[PDB]
Amino acid sequence: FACKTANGTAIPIGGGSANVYVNLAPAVNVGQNLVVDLSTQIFCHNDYPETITDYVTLQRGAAYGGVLSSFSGTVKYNGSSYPFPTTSETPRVVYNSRTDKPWPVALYLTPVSSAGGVAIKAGSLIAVLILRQTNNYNSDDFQFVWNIYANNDVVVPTG
Amino acid sequence: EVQLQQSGAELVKPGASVKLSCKASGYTFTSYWMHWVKQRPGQGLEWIGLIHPNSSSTYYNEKFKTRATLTVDKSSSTAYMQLSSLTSEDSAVYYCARLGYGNSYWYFDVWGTGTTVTVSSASTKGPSVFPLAPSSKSTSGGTAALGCLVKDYFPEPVTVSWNSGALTSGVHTFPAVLQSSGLYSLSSVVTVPSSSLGTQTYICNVNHKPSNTKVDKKVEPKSC
Amino acid sequence: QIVLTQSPALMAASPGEKVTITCSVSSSISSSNLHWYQQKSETSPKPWIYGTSNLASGVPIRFSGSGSGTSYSLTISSLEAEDAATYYCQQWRSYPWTFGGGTKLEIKRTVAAPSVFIFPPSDEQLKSGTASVVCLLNNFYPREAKVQWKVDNALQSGNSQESVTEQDSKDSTYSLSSTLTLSKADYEKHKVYACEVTHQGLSSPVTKSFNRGE
Numbered sequence: 272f273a274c275k276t277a278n279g280t281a282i283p284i285g286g287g288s289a290n291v292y293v294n295l296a297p298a299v300n301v302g303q304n305l306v307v308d309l310s311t312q313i314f315c316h317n318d319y320p321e322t323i324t325d326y327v328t329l330q331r332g333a334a335y336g337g338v339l340s341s342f343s344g345t346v347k348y349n350g351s352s353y354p355f356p357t358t359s360e361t362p363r364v365v366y367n368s369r370t371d372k373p374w375p376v377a378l379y380l381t382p383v384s385s386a387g388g389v390a391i392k393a394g395s396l397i398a399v400l401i402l403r404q405t406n407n408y409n410s411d412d413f414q415f416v417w418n419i420y421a422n423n424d425v426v427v428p429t430g
Numbered sequence: 431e432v433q434l435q436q437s438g439a440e441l442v443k444p445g446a447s448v449k450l451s452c453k454a455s456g457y458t459f460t461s462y463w464m465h466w467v468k469q470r471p472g473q474g475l476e477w478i479g480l481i482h483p484n485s486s487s488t489y490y491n492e493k494f495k496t497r498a499t500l501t502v503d504k505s506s507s508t509a510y511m512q513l514s515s516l517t518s519e520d521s522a523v524y525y526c527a528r529l530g531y532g533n534s535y536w537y538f539d540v541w542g543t544g545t546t547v548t549v550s551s552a553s554t555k556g557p558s559v560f561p562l563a564p565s566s567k568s569t570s571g572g573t574a575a576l577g578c579l580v581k582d583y584f585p586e587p588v589t590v591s592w593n594s595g596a597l598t599s600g601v602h603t604f605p606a607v608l609q610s611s612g613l614y615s616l617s618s619v620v621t622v623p624s625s626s627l628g629t630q631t632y633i634c635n636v637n638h639k640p641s642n643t644k645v646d647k648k649v650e651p652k653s654c
Numbered sequence: 655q656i657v658l659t660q661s662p663a664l665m666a667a668s669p670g671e672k673v674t675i676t677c678s679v680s681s682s683i684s685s686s687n688l689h690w691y692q693q694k695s696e697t698s699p700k701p702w703i704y705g706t707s708n709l710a711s712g713v714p715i716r717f718s719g720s721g722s723g724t725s726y727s728l729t730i731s732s733l734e735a736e737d738a739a740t741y742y743c744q745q746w747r748s749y750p751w752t753f754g755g756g757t758k759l760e761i762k763r764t765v766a767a768p769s770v771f772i773f774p775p776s777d778e779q780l781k782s783g784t785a786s787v788v789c790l791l792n793n794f795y796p797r798e799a800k801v802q803w804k805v806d807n808a809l810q811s812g813n814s815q816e817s818v819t820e821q822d823s824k825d826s827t828y829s830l831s832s833t834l835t836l837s838k839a840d841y842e843k844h845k846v847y848a849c850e851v852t853h854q855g856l857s858s859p860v861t862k863s864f865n866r867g868e
Contacts, residue, residue, distance in 0.1 A: 475699075475744070477751035530704075535689075541699050562788070563776070575790070602792070603819075619792070
C-alpha cells in the first residue's frame with residue numbers, strides 16, 4: 272500500500288510523486304552496463320497482506336533527463352527483462368509481506384553507442400518510475416511516481 | 431593485498447614527455463576503472479582522468495585535455511602517460527588509482543607506488559658531500575651534531591646515509607632548495623653521542639640514481 | 655570547474671584531538687558526491703572516505719565524514735599520531751572532478767626547545783671556491799622559523815636558504831637547515847660569523863657564532 276525511497280522522500284498511501292536521488296557508477300562504457308540498482312534505493316511494502324494480497328507492478332517507466340539523452344537500457348523486474356522506458360505492463364510481483372522488501376527493479380542502462388562527452392548531469396532526472404498498486408480487496412488502482420534524480424555524473428568516455 | 435606498482439622518480443628535461451607507468455597483472459584489469467591523479471608540491475591534488483582497461487576508453491579533465499594521455503595495456507596490465515609540453519607547471523608527483531565499488535559509489539580504492547616528475551632544466555650533477563666538524567669547542571656539551579652537505583645535486587633521488595646500514599636515529603635528510611645556480615642542494619645531519627667516547631668513523635655516502643655515484647667520505651671532528 | 659575550498663593548508667592536533675577539516679563547495683552537492691583521500695608525505699595516497707560517510711579499506715573507525723549541501727566535514731573521534739597526512743577533498747558531482755587544495759594535517763606537539771648548531775665550511779669547501787656556512791635547528795616546533803645570518807655582526811639578506819623537514823615519526827618535531835652561501839675570498843675576509851634563532855628559541859634569541867681560522 273506504500274512505497275518509500277532510501278532518501279526518505281516517501282510516497283503517501285494514495286499515490287503521489289517524490290524524488291529518488293541515485294548514486295551511480297561515475298563511469299560506464301558501451302557494452303558495460305550502468306546498473307542503476309533501484310532495488311537498493313526504492314522499496315515498497317503492504318499494510319497487511321493477510322487479506323489485501325497486494326499486487327504491485329511497474330505500470331510505467333519513462334526516460335527523462337540524462338537517461339533520455341544517451342543511456343538506453345532495459346528494466347529488470349524480478350530478474351526478467353522489459354524495454355525501458357517501460358511502455359507496457361509488468362507482471363505482478365505481489366510483495367505479500369508486511370516487512371519491506373527491496374522492490375526488485377534494476378535499470379540496466381547501457382549508454383548509446385559512444386554517445387558523447389559528459390552524460391547524466393548531476394542533480395538531473397534519471398527516470399520516472401510510475402508504479403501501479405492493485406489488490407483483490409478493492410479497486411484502489413493507486414499511482415506511485417518516483418522521479419529518479421541522478422546524485423552524480425556518469426561519463427561515456429571517448430576512445 | 432594485491433597492489434599497483436609504479437616507476438621511480440624520473441628525470442625529464444623541459445619539453446620532454448614522461449613514460450610514467452602503473453602496472454598490476456594480479457588483480458585482473460578487466461574488472462576496474464584505472465584512474466589517474468596528480469599532486470603538486472604544496473598545491474593540492476588535480477584529477478587527471480580515467481581509462482578503461484576493458485576497452486581503452488578515456489575521460490580526462492578540462493585542465494588536462496591535450497595535456498595527459500592515459501593509456502592501458504591490459505594484456506601486460508600496464509598503463510603509461512603521455513605528457514607532451516611538460517612544463518614546470520606540470521612538475522608534480524603523478525599517481526595511479528582505480529575506482530572500486532564501495533556501496534553505490536566508486537572511488538580510488540587502491541593506489542600505485544607513486545612517481546615524482548621533475549622538470550628542472552640543465553644537466554644532472556653529483557652529490558658532493560661536505561663534512562661538518564661538530565661542536566668540539568663546547569666539548570663538555572655532549573649533544574654536538576655533525577652532517578654532510580650535498581650541494582649541487584639534481585634531481586632528487588638522493589639517499590645520503592650514515593654508516594650505510596645503521597644510524598637510523600638522528601639522520602635528517604633535508605628537502606632540497608632551488609639554489610641560485612639552479613642545481614638543488616640538501617644536507618643531512620646526525621646527532622652523534624657525547625665526546626671522548628664518541629670516536630667513530632662517521633661514513634656518509636650518497637647514491638644519486640640518474641648519475642649513479644657512491645660519493646662518500648668520513649666526517650672526522652676537528653680540534654680547532 | 656567546481657571550486658572546492660577547504661581549510662587552506664594548515665592543521666594540527668594531538669594524539670586524540672578532533673580535526674574538523676571543512677570542505678566548502680561552490681555548489682550544494684549531495685553527500686554521494688564527496689570523497690576524501692589521505693596522502694602521507696612522499697608516500698602514495700590512500701582512499702579515506704567515499705560518499706562522505708563510508709570509509710574505505712583500512713581506514714580506521716575514528717574517521718567519519720558528515721554534512722551535506724555546500725558544507726562538508728571529516729569529524730574524527732580520536733586522531734592518532736599516525737594519521738598525519740594531507741587529506742585531499744574530491745568532488746564527484748561534476749567532472750572537472752576538482753580535488754581540493756589539500757589540508758596538510760600536521761601534528762601539534764609540546765613546545766620543543768630549538769637547538770642551534772653553527773657549522774663552518776671544511777677545508778675542502780674552501781678548496782672548491784664556494785664556501786657555505788650552515789646553521790642547523792635540530793628539533794623544534796612550530797615550523798615558523800627565520801634565523802638571522804650576521805656577517806661581522808652585520809645582517810645579510812637574499813643569501814640564506816632555509817630547508818625544513820617533514821614531521822618526524824619519533825618526536826614530531828621539525829628540522830631547519832639555513833644555508834648561507836658565499837665564496838672563499840669573502841668568507842675569509844670576515845672573521846665572526848653568527849646566526850640568531852627565532853620563534854620560541856628565546857625572547858632574547860640565542861646567537862650561535864664562530865670565528866674563522868680559530
